[PDB]
A paper describes a structure:
We next determined the crystal structure of [name] in complex with a 15-nt constitutive decay element (CDE) of human intermediate early response 3 (Ier3) RNA at 2.5 Å resolution. Surprisingly, each asymmetric unit (ASU) contains two protein molecules, two single-stranded RNAs, and one double-stranded (ds) RNA. The single-stranded RNA binds to the winged helix-turn-helix (wHTH)-like region of the [name] domain, similar to previously reported RC3H1 structures in complex with different CDE RNAs212223, while the RNA duplex binds to the HEPN and [name] domains simultaneously. The single-stranded Ier3 RNA forms a stem-loop structure containing five Watson-Crick base pairs and a UGU trinucleotide loop. The stem-loop RNA interacts with the [name] domain mainly using most of the phosphate groups in the 5′ arm and the trinucleotide loop, while the 3′ half of the stem does not form direct interaction with the protein. A detailed crystallographic analysis suggests that the two [name] molecules in the ASU bind to the RNA duplex in a similar but not identical way. Both protein molecules use residues in the [name] domain to interact with the backbone of one RNA strand (chain C), while residues in the HEPN domain interact with the backbone of the other RNA strand (chain D). Notably, side chains of Ser312, Gln315, and Asp319 of both protein molecules form hydrogen bonds with the hydroxyl group on the pentose ring of two adjacent ribonucleotides, suggesting an RNA- but not DNA-specific interaction. The most distinctive feature is the interaction between the guanidinium group of the Arg128 side chain from the HEPN domain of protein molecule A with the purine base of the central G8 from RNA chain D. In contrast, the two [name] molecules in the Ier3 complex bind to the dsRNA in a head-to-toe mode, and the two protein molecules do not interact. Indeed, when [name] binds to the dsRNA, the [name] domain rotates 42° along an axis intersecting the HEPN and [name] domains to accommodate the interactions.
Roquins are a family of RNA-binding proteins critically involved in maintaining peripheral immunological tolerance and preventing autoimmune diseases. The human genome encodes two Roquin paralogs, RC3H1 and [name]. The N-terminal regions of these two proteins are highly homologous and are composed of a RING (Really Interesting New Gene)-type E3 ubiquitin ligase domain, followed by a unique, so-called [name] domain of approximately 300 amino acid residues and a CCCH-type ZnF domain5. The [name] domain binds to a highly conserved, stem-loop-forming constitutive decay element (CDE), which is found in the 3′ UTR of many mRNAs encoding regulators of development and inflammation.
Author numbering:
A (entry chain B): 88 to 110, 125 to 396
B (entry chain A): 92 to 111, 125 to 397
RNA sequence: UGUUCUGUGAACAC
RNA sequence: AUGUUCUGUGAACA
RNA sequence: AUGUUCUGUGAACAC
RNA sequence: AUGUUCUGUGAACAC
């Protein structure tokens, strides 16, 4: 009858089908499934929540798919290879700390030095505590900060450019954060997904910087991250061959990535609700099919 | 330093409440205290002000716990009536106050009886319930608010002029609104700007106006007055949990200088303040869990 | 469940 | 600028 | 991997 | 609750 809405029924059935996975999947997937299942599709507010819950479920699916294709043994080596490919370097937790402190010693006050003068400033003062220090190794550290936009660079006609630390990076805490963020950026760009615990170990040699690294990771997320993660997965699958044809999920993940995650977003049409619930249904089914058959 | 260690431990003990219950303002003020670096003199100064701030809010939270939200309106109007005052509704009060201005705008001096009749006569057509009694209660509200310059006469009715500063509607209504807020405060009632807008105007379009009034009544004396106000609430309720035990702690916290250019604390003063605020916030949590209402 | 990170606008006071 | 109140989301790890 | 040059969101060399 | 008296930062009465 005309009192029955066909879009509503497909949406409802998709959610019911997904709810069967609760009674396996990861804890984050379970939590996000529960959130979707609790959305009341008879209300406009619950329909808005269902759209965001579907997006959230989908973004988590892509993350888990990428992690399944990622070699944990080779993770550190790939990071440092990616860092070196940009002319950058990490000299170890102790030596990097000291190096960045020596950069602050030079530029805290707003002085403008040349790259050559800045490198030597650091190498000289660093050599006693760390004899391996060199113009090359310290040049790579300065390049890391350059790539991070830490410097205001002033060109001079037919001469070496002068470099000042920007006002916002003239403390150790601010400078080290941006430095850490830049290494995270390089990892992201190379399609590496590294946990806060792993990052703390890599950059500080302890597990006492999880929260600091977690803060940096979360500040680099945007609403474009879901769409970029799908493109990333495509690159991973092209590299691996794609036995399970996870490429079939592409237009579903794209649709989910195009959902507005803001809470003050325009509420969905009935067609949009059905399409989102079918998309997320297919995507979560694809993940479970992969775990069981193509592990 | 034994004083430093007690202070540090008190703050650590309080930091446990950030994990699970307390209100968002209590959480914000706990965070501020926890972030104070007690190894520095500047952080020790901040810790004293944060402890005071956290204590003043605890008194607010204690008062709110003795507050049934369903009975909040009835308790307000009961408190208003207890002072011989009255609120006749948003429409009728507006009209009444405008009629008071019609009489006294120019600086005329009328007797209370003449002023009441002036209003009742002109108000009766639009509002038939108007009376000498009901309008007398409104005039009393303005009297209690110090809106009138009163001139005594030997063996005769006193004359009353509106003070210069209240000879416009906006100024007179503000002071009128402030006086009802005052009465609520004195009866140990804590009402939000949104609730006040609804009570006094019948809409939510006067939040800011009421918020302005509330914030202007906020001074460094407020903390000490709020403690006396809680005492009145507890005397009315009987005080099963013996929240009166917190009185000298709240008094100590109320006596802290809230100015940023205040003399920095001694180690003894730091310990005492951290122990006082610890006991006070613990008293709030003990009350919520064991003596809920 | 625990341990963390992260996120919006609107008013008012000086 | 600084403060106060109200209001607003998701995410990571075991 | 390491080093050297250079005004580099990075280039070019050496071993 | 409401009303009446009154020079009330509020008193005293009635019902
Ligand atoms: Cl239907």
């Amino acid at each position: 009858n005309l009192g029955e809405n066909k879009h509503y029924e497909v949406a409802k059935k998709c959610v019911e089908d997904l709810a069967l996975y609760l009674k396996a999947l990861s804890r984050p997937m379970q939590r996000k499934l529960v959130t979707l299942v609790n959305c009341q599709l008879v209300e406009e507010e619950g329909r808005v929540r269902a759209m965001r819950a579907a997006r959230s479920l989908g973004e988590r699916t892509v993350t888990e798919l990428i992690l399944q294709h990622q070699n944990p043994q080779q993770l550190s080596a790939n990071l440092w290879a990616a860092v070196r490919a940009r002319g950058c370097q990490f000299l170890g937790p102790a030596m990097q700390e000291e190096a960045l402190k020596l950069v602050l010693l030079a530029l805290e006050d707003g002085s403008a030095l040349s790259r050559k003068v800045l490198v030597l400033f650091v190498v000289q003062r660093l050599e006693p505590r760390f004899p391996q220090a060199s113009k090359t190794s310290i040049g790579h550290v300065v390049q890391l900060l350059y790539r991070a936009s830490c410097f205001k660079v002033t060109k001079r006609d037919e001469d070496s450019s002068l470099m000042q630390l920007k006002e916002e990076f003239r403390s150790y805490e601010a400078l080290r954060r941006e430095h850490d963020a830049q290494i995270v950026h390089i990892a992201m760009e190379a399609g590496l997904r590294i946990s806060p615990e792993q990052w703390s170990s890599l950059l500080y040699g302890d597990l006492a910087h999880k929260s600091h690294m977690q803060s940096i990771i979360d500040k680099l997320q945007s609403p474009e991250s879901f769409a970029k993660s799908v493109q990333e997965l495509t690159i991973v699958l092209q590299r691996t061959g794609d036995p399970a044809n996870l490429n079939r999920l592409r237009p579903h993940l794209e649709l989910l990535a195009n959902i507005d995650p803001n809470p003050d977003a325009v509420s969905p049409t009935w067609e949009q609700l059905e399409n989102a619930m079918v998309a997320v249904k297919t995507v979560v089914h694809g993940l479970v099919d992969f775990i069981q058959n193509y592990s």
